From a paper:
The [name] subfamily plays important roles in specific trafficking events such as exocytosis, endosomal recycling, and cytokinesis. [name] and [name]-like (SH3BP5L) proteins have recently been found to serve as guanine nucleotide exchange factors (GEF) for [name]. [name] exhibits a V-shaped structure comprising two coiled coils. The coiled coil composed of α1, and α4 is solely responsible for the [name] binding and GEF activity.
To elucidate the GEF mechanism of [name], we also determined the crystal structure of [name] in the complex with [name] at 3.8 Å resolution. Wild-type [name] (10–276) was used for crystallization of the complex because [name]-RA tended to crystallize in the apo form. The asymmetric unit contains four complexes, where [name] interacts with [name] in a similar manner. The electron density corresponding to the N- and C-terminal regions of [name] (residues 10–41 and 268–276, respectively) and the N-terminal four residues of [name] were invisible, suggesting the structural disorder of these regions. In the [name]–[name] complex, both switch regions (switch I and switch II) of [name] interact with the coiled coil comprising α1 and α4 of [name]. As compared with the GTP- or GDP-bound [name] structures, the switch I region is pulled out by [name] so as to facilitate the release of the bound guanine nucleotide and Mg2+ (21). The switch II region adopts a helical structure, which is also observed in the inactive, GDP-bound state of [name]. In summary, [name] opens the guanine nucleotide-binding pocket by capturing both switch regions. On the other hand, the P loop region, which binds to β- and γ-phosphate groups, does not contact [name] and remains folded as in the GDP- and GTP-bound structures. [name] interacts with the N-terminal region, interswitch, switch I, and switch II of [name] in the [name]–[name] complex.
Residue numbers in the entry:
A (entry chain E): 4 to 173
B (entry chain A): 42 to 265
Amino acid sequence: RDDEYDYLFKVVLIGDSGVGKSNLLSRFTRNEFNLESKSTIGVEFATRSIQVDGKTIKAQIWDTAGQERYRAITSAYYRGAVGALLVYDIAKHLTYENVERWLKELRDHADSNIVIMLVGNKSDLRHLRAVPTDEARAFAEKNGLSFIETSALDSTNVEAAFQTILTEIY
Amino acid sequence: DPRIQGELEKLNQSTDDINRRETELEDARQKFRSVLVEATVKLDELVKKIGKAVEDSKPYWEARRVARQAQLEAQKATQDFQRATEVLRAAKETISLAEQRLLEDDKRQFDSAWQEMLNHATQRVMEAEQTKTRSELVHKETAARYNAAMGRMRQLEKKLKRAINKSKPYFELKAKYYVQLEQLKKTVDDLQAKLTLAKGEYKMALKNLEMISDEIHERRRSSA
């Protein structure tokens, strides 16, 4: 009797594959599928319900749809979205250039009134930061978006940001 | 595989369908609380005004709701008796017409077709008189409770004449807020039912996707 909630916000995980969006919300969120659905469905589901303003809010996290197939149904993927998380790798400068394309992907299909958070995660455990934090944090505030740069070890900053995004909606 | 787009888009609509109902539920319930607290404070201020007649008239109004209740009983039993009386009228008419054909042709009493038209006709009247007498006693008993409840009410009207007059605006306002809360109760109970059907439709539109995901995994194990 812990699946009870009041509201249901919908946020999505977008960006390039391999950045580790799936493994970032491993300890926080709860994947509702016991087996990988990216290889089949293309999209994976996970959720984490918290209490905001006296009400239990269960946010629904839709994982990366993937480039290879099922791009036509990404229109329904982006629809009804409340928030979005851009996760690029700080070691790979290419992932920082593609998030500019995923942003324009939201402006075409996803809802206009969405709150997006740009996340720079250190997945590549062997390389330095090709993307400067200064220029990364500056670019995020130029598009009216939030920003946070985290690592695989300290999962403290991540969970605190997930509690903030949901509160702003209500 | 092509079933996915139909599920996600409906999962999408169901998500909004949940939030739109819980919000209305949160609103309807809030307006329900606002009235019950309003009904609570406005009833007490009438108790602090003239409370001498309020508690003394309660036996009357409680003896009046009984009279009304015993009235609907005597009213339903009358309709059920009136209906049960028309059963015999259509039954005894059939068993009377059969006797008429017996006087016309006396040799008809050996005809197997006429014996069957009597057998079923004389069977209905057996079951008709049974349901009649049962409905007849109920008609009289429910009428007795009515006349008794009319006595209980009228007698209490004599004793508490001055009482019910000073307490009349209390019970009148009490019922006005009753129906209002009753309506607000219905608008909450059904919205929480619609909310459940919204969450349920959302919970089932996820499990099928897990089935689809697990269905492909089994096909990826064997041959194409």
